[PDB]
């Protein structure tokens, strides 16, 4: 028998479910969800250096 106990505290949550990579589509108007930032735009190539 394995008993799983889940608790929530004031500290930020750090145990969390799997995140889906899905796939990337470019040069089309697509809803994007990048690291919690949502919106709608065309993802073209960028010459900016981060």
């Amino acid at each position: 028998v394995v008993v799983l106990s889940f608790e929530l505290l004031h500290a930020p949550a750090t145990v969390c479910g799997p995140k889906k990579s899905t796939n990337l589509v470019k040069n089309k108007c697509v809803n994007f969800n990048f690291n919690g930032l949502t919106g709608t735009g065309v993802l073209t190539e960028s010459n900016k250096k981060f």
Binding site: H10, A11, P12, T14
Partner: protein
């Protein structure tokens, strides 16, 4: 030791500790004398 000009300070490591901090202290390195058990030094 505090020079002029600007040197941007880059990030190093953000840590989700979530604890209470009010005091801090510096840790130094000391070598055993093997001969006054630790070699004299300054920081």
């Amino acid at each position: 030791d505090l020079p002029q000009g600007f040197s941007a300070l880059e990030p190093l490591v953000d840590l989700p500790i979530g604890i209470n901090i009010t005091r801090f202290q510096t840790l130094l390195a000391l070598h055993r004398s093997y001969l006054s058990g630790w070699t004299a030094g300054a920081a």
